[PDB]
Amino acid sequence: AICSALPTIPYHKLADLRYLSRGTVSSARHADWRVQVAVKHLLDSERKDVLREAEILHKARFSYILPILGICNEPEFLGIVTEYMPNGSLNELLHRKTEYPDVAWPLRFRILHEIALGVNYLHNMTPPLLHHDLKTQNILLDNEFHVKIADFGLSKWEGGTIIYMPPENYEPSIKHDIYSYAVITWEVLSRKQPFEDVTNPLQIMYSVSQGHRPVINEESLPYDIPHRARMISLIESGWAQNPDERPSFLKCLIELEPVLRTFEEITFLEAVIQLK
Amino acid sequence: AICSALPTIPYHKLADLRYLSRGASGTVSSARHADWRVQVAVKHLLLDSERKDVLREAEILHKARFSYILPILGICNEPEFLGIVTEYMPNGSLNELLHRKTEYPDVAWPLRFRILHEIALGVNYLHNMTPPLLHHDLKTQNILLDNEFHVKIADFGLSTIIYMPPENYESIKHDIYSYAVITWEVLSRKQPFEDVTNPLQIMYSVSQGHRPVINEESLPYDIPHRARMISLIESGWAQNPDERPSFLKCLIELEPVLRTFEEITFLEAVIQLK
Numbered sequence: 395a396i397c398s399a400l401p402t403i404p405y406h407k408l409a410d411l412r413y414l415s416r417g418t419v420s421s422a423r424h425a426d427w428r429v430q431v432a433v434k435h436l437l438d439s440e441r442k443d444v445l446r447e448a449e450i451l452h453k454a455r456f457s458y459i460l461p462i463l464g465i466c467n468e469p470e471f472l473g474i475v476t477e478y479m480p481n482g483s484l485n486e487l488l489h490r491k492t493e494y495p496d497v498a499w500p501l502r503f504r505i506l507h508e509i510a511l512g513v514n515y516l517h518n519m520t521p522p523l524l525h526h527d528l529k530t531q532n533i534l535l536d537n538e539f540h541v542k543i544a545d546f547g548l549s550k551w552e553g554g555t556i557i558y559m560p561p562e563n564y565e566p567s568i569k570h571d572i573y574s575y576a577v578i579t580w581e582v583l584s585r586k587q588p589f590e591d592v593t594n595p596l597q598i599m600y601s602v603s604q605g606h607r608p609v610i611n612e613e614s615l616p617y618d619i620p621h622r623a624r625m626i627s628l629i630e631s632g633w634a635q636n637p638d639e640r641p642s643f644l645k646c647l648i649e650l651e652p653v654l655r656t657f658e659e660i661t662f663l664e665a666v667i668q669l670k
Numbered sequence: 671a672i673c674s675a676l677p678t679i680p681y682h683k684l685a686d687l688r689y690l691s692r693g694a695s696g697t698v699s700s701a702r703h704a705d706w707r708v709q710v711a712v713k714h715l716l717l718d719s720e721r722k723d724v725l726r727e728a729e730i731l732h733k734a735r736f737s738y739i740l741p742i743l744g745i746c747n748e749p750e751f752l753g754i755v756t757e758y759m760p761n762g763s764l765n766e767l768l769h770r771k772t773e774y775p776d777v778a779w780p781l782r783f784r785i786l787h788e789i790a791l792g793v794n795y796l797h798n799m800t801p802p803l804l805h806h807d808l809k810t811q812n813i814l815l816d817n818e819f820h821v822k823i824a825d826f827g828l829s830t831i832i833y834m835p836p837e838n839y840e841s842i843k844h845d846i847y848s849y850a851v852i853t854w855e856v857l858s859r860k861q862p863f864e865d866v867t868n869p870l871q872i873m874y875s876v877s878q879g880h881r882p883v884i885n886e887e888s889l890p891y892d893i894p895h896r897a898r899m900i901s902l903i904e905s906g907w908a909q910n911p912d913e914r915p916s917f918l919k920c921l922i923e924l925e926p927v928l929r930t931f932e933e934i935t936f937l938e939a940v941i942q943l944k
């Protein structure tokens with residue numbers, strides 16, 4: 395096999411450094427490469443955390459995995475330099491309903507297809523690489539609303555949200571990811587926050603362990619949803635209470651492939667224009 | 671000290687291996703990866719050190735990973751078969767877009783400028799690696815176009831003559847010459863030295879300071895930022911290498927031009943296409 399090194403970017407090379415999202419993510423431009431970049435940064439000497447993610451991104455290079463451009467490793471500042479995703483996260487697409495009144499079905503299905511393509515690829519690495527922290531927050535969208543999977547901090551070969559975590563991992567597995575995906579799939583097709591009613595996050599955890607899942611009915615998932623039955627089948631088998639009843643991503647892709655072929659090329663382009 | 675390795679792809683994983691294009695440095699065939707579930711492109715020729723050439727290109731594509739460079743997915747090296755597995759480019763080359771005028775009647779200005787900016791961004795990145803990696807074979811056939819008509823440059827750092835600077839017949843300044851010619855081609859949709867029969871007549875004309883024609887027939891007065899582009903073109907293909915700009919300079923000239931196009935106008939230029 396052949397080897398490739400991740401470039402070292404001097405901090406001084408990053409211009410127009412502005413805050414983007416809370417480590418912390420900042421937008422910037424590289425003074426020589428003349429492109430916009432995003433920089434994730436903190437500072438402790440237990441900073442192998444930053445170097446580990448960088449190494450993962452660098453080795454997990456693929457079409458649907460956030461491309462890393464370089465490491466910014468200095469005594470003064472430590473950061474990960476990646477491509478800038480101008481359309482943020484899938485979370486913001488699904489839930490900023492004023493800004494995005496419509497998110498057309500072909501786009502929703504392409505996003506789902508692409509999330510699955512990235513994760514599958516990770517799972518097919520040698521040895522398999524598991525995400526373990528899939529959430530709408532980490533599904534980044536480029537200029538044409540194509541998927542780039544990010545956040546490999548909790549990924550292996552204090553925190554936040556719990557709704558995408560399988561019940562078996564509550565007291566800490568190649569089947570964690572699919573559960574997360576299933577919840578994402580549900581959230582994507584509904585534009586509903588999972589366990590919307592339940593305000594107490596610990597209460598959610600109780601319910602989930604008692605077999606409960608987000609509500610699958612006419613109200614959340616309408617009848618007009620393309621391939622509703624085949625999708626609901628996928629969502630349910632994905633978020634199974636039993637880990638062994640959950641499908642691989644390869645299996646899901648095979649299921650999704652003809653579903654994606656039912657949408658004409660132009661509808662993706664139409665969906666993106668509607669959002670801009 | 672962070673290092674990434676190029677995956678090895680087993681030939682049996684490459685399903686539906688149908689022919690696509692040829693001549694680049696061998697034959698390019700489209701396929702689909704059986705495990706990854708994505709369309710790919712494969713470049714294949716067995717000779718003695720012709721094998722070392724295929725590995726040399728694969729190493730280059732793998733070391734020169736960037737937003738505007740064709741991403742290499744893996745090498746397919748076996749006693750039976752040898753090929754470079756890259757992403758698939760559904761819109762082919764810049765050459766096809768510019769010259770298939772019945773298929774593409776309108777290639778809106780915003781898209782043309784974006785293609786020009788990206789080609790420059792790609793080459794610039796190469797020139798900024800350590801050591802500087804020179805393209806030396808930049809042509810409209812090498813500029814590939816993805817699903818949204820974004821540029822991916824290919825076939826670089828390996829060495830038609832219409833893009834070759836005159837001094838190269840018998841240099842950090844080679845690529846900018848090619849870029850200047852490409853720019854002229856992109857803005858005019860004409861083939862450079864259209865009325866010239868023999869490639870030797872070109873080579874001779876070029877060496878005498880002759881360049882693709884610049885007037886109202888080739889570059890119509892309604893071209894956005896026309897004066898400005900002509901300058902870039904003329905300094906870029908200047909007879910004297912020293913008088914040609916660096917890609918940095920060229921980018922600084924282009925940046926203000928690209929800012930004048932609204933983000934939506936690129937998308938609308940793309941949807942209009944076949």
Ligand SMILES: NC(=O)c1cnn(-c2ccccc2)c1N
Nearest residue numbers: 419432434476477478479544545
């Ligand atoms: N909006 C962006 O481009 C963005 C947000 N987070 N990240 C990110 C950067 C480094 C690691 C993980 C995510 C981006 N690239």
Ligand SMILES: NC(=O)c1cnn(-c2ccccc2)c1N
Nearest residue numbers: 698711713756757758759762824
């Ligand atoms: N149409 C394509 O995807 C294409 C044409 N040539 N190449 C290519 C493949 C490997 C090396 C150089 C060019 C492609 N990927």
Ligand SMILES: [Ca+2]
Nearest residue numbers: 493494668669
């Ligand atoms: Ca809107």
